[PDB]
Structure 1
Amino acid sequence: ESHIILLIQQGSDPKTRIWSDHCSLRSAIEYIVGVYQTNDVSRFFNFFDEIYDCVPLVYDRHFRAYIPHEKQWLLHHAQEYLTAARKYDFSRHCTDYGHSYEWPYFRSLR
């Protein structure tokens, strides 16, 4: 029952907003990396830092609520993900579910 939502805003204009939901932290990291690869590591963190706003929300099983984190929180996890391995399109793999009907919170209400 892991669920992570990324509130992404590409530029200073809120018109560029898009959100992604994933079933695990690895899926969230693989998503944002796959977004950068729609066109190096250090150049990737250049791309990540250029994102105007990106606040992750992680779901808590017991409290049944989403914990907000800073943009730096996803930086640290993405950093250690890339160590163990050895126009941008933000809709690429931007969801592991078809509808919020499938999210862990809404399934528990049945």
Structure 2
Amino acid sequence: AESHIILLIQQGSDPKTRIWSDHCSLRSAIEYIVGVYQTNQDVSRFFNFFDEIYDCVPLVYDRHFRAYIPHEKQWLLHHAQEYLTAA
């Protein structure tokens, strides 16, 4: 219901690594995956980490239709690229 973004992460096929987190904004979702990347150690290295080591899917809350919309991993990764280049 409330949470703007629900993030679904996993490391390979291990069901024990399937961790979800709730975020009040896209910024908060981006800071979370940068956090995952930082604690488990460049744009190319960041993208490859989320293509080979971890997998992630954002579910974005559509307030008008009271529904969660799944978005592609590349959508969140592209927005993260815009955060990392600015900061």
Q: Aligning the two structures, in what range does the TM-score lie when normalised by the shorter sequence?
A: 0.7 to 0.9
What count of residue pairs does the alignment treat as equivalent? Answer: 85
- CA distance 1:80–1:16, shift in 2 (3 Å): same
Shift of 1:2: 6.2
Could you tell me whether the CA contact under 8 Å between 1:59 and 1:65 is conserved in 2? yes
**TM-score (norm: length of structure 1):** 0.67
Which structure has the larger Rg over C-alpha atoms?
1
**Which stretches of structure 1, 4 residues or more, deviate above 3 A after TM superposition?**
none
Could you tell me whether the CA contact under 8 Å between 2:6 and 2:59 is conserved in 1? yes
Shift of 1:29: 0.3
The aligned counterpart of 1:31 is 32
Cα distance in 2 for residues equivalent to 1:17 and 1:2: 18
Cα distance in 1 for residues equivalent to 2:54 and 2:85: 25
Gaps of 5+ in 2: none
Q: Residue 37 of structure 1 aligns to a residue in which SS? A: helix
Q: Residue 85 of structure 2 aligns to a residue in which SS? A: helix
User: Percent same amino acid at aligned positions?
Assistant: 100
Shift of 1:12: 1.6
For residues 31-83 of structure 1, the C-alpha deviation after alignment (integer angstroms, 9 at most, x for no partner) is 11012211433322221222453221000111111011111111110111111
Write 1 or 2 for the structure with the bigger share of strand.
2
Could you tell me whether the CA contact under 8 Å between 2:7 and 2:22 is conserved in 1? yes
Gaps of 5+ in 1: 86-110
**TM-score (norm: length of structure 2):** 0.83
Could you tell me whether the CA contact under 8 Å between 2:59 and 2:71 is conserved in 1? yes
